[PDB]
Design a protein around this ligand. Structure first.
Ligand SMILES: CC1(C)COC2(CC[C@@H](CC(=O)O)[C@H](Cc3ccccc3)C2)OC1
Length: 134
């Protein structure tokens, strides 16, 4: 057993708050915000050795990242930003930092009760998204 066991599996979005405002703060344009805000993604997390894979599947986009904790990678986000990302585990929370154009956003994923809670922060704006097991 290991590092991310309680994250592994298939998760479905059940609530969102403040996500349009988070996307505005990131710089996402109107049409992408509307369609992405409507999305109801499933998040699929798996681990093979030291490699963690996180997929987000929705009617808007299907994305996939694979990474090693603490080891930076280049990522194309669903809104087509080219970012440099690093994901670490900090006290049981997966912390995903994206850097681009002198900007930074952090996405935190944690287990709370039977939920996987996702907190997205861009300057002073936070969005909270809650997932349950599918
Ligand atoms: C456009 C974005 C700025 C691109 O990056 C994210 C970062 C936070 C993610 C939060 C989560 O996993 O629920 C989110 C997932 C998602 C939402 C809607 C459609 C497809 C994927 C993707 O926010 C919207």
């Amino acid at each position: 057993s290991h590092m991310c066991d309680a994250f592994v599996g298939t998760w479905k979005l059940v609530s969102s708050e403040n996500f349009d405002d988070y996307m505005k703060e990131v710089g996402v344009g109107f049409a992408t915000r509307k369609v992405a805000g409507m999305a109801k993604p499933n998040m699929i997390i798996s681990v093979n050795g030291d490699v963690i894979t996180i997929k987000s599947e929705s009617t808007f986009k299907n994305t996939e990242i694979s990474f090693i904790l603490g080891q930076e990678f280049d990522e194309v986000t669903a809104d087509d930003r080219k970012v440099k990302s690093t994901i670490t585990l900090d006290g049981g929370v997966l912390v995903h930092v994206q850097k681009w154009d002198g900007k930074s956003t952090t996405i935190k994923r944690k287990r709370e009760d039977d939920k996987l809670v996702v907190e997205c922060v861009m300057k002073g704006v936070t969005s909270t998204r809650v997932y349950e097991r599918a």
